[PDB]
Amino acid sequence: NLMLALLTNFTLATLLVIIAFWLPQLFSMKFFLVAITFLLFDLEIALLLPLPWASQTANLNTMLTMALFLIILLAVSLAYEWTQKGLE
Amino acid sequence: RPTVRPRNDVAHKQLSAFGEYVAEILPKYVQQVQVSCFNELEICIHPDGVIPVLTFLRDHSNAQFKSLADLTAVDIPTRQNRFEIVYNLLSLRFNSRIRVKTYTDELTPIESSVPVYKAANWYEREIWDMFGVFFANHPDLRRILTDYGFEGHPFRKDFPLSGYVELRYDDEVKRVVAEPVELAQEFRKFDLNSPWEAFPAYRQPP
């Protein structure tokens, strides 16, 4: 069971907190541009995720031109990051 | 002499030329007294103009000093005029050390050396801290070596070594560190001063 496996880890993690809790008795907007680019790149990663699991039944010649195409534009988005990104 | 003498005088006459050269200009505004002893030159300056003396020695065709590096002050209560701010200057191109002194009591403000020398402002803060001499037209006059809740000026010979506010208790108040307590351990005042005069020629007639 996956449900039994996950819940056992969290319940033991909660118990460790109580041990320390119960027993003893006596600005800058330049960071934002980095965070946004993380999200926009990971969505291109999300489109490029199926590649090892997808390419099994589909035609290779039709895929080859389209598979590289996403990575090329992923570099063009980084090419726009070279024309003055900032001090970061 | 082999071990008794440190160095024979040879450059003393060469350094005495500086004692004439600056004095050849002869300003009552600047020059006054020129003293030269033990391969070193000492000049004291009239309070009215200190900046024009410091612009001199800086650059100049005959002698190039540039570095107006180290800055001291003397506390002495014998004279009618109390403090004596002493400038120690060094040359890199010329390789010589000359001294600039002030004779004024300087409880009243004195002209600053900030426009001529960049690092002079940090030393000027120390003189206002320890001695209490204000510099006119000074940028950022802030306390460095003194405490934030310190009264008076810590170096002046008028008050004791221990001070007035020095001991800091904690005791009764949970967070506030104490200040008004004044008592300290007894510093033994030594009265060791030798009878008979130490050296001839230094004796002054009353």
Binding site: - | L145, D147, G163
Partner: protein, 147 residues
């Protein structure tokens, strides 16, 4: 009855095993405190860890001279410390002002700011003598909370 007496020593053994000191670089003493890291004389991972940190550390070594400017500064560090805290006044300046003392700025005794449990008398406190300060601290922990 027997289990009560033996369990108390086990908690005391935990502090006898490891002690994390504060790295105060406020002295010439602090250079000798860096000789505790120097391999020839080591308490490093024998008990001492040089990670320090203002909150996680159990021990704080007041290294040498303290001025009236640092008197409120060192006090707030002591409040951030956990309840099992031991303060070592390593150096003659920390004991009661080795030099200076009668001076205006230097605080006498350190106990006027922060209470001291272990005193180390040495100016250049030799690493050999510094090894006693930690070993005595481990020996001093004997009994805590009877009832």
């Amino acid at each position: 009855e027997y289990v009560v007496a033996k369990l108390d020593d086990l908690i005391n053994w935990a502090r006898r095993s490891s002690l994390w000191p504060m790295t105060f670089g406020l002295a010439c003493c602090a250079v000798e405190m860096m000789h505790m890291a120097a391999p020839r004389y080591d308490m490093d991972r024998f008990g001492v860890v040089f990670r320090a940190s203002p909150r996680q550390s159990d021990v704080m070594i007041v290294a040498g001279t303290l001025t009236n400017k640092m008197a409120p500064a060192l006090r707030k560090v002591y409040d951030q410390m956990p309840e099992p805290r031991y303060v070592v006044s390593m150096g003659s300046c920390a004991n009661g002002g080795g030099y200076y003392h009668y001076s205006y700025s230097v605080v006498r005794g350190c106990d006027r700011i922060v209470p001291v449990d272990i005193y180390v008398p040495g100016c250049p406190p030799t690493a050999e003598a510094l090894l006693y300060g930690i070993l005595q601290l481990q020996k001093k922990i004997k009994r805590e909370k009877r009832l």
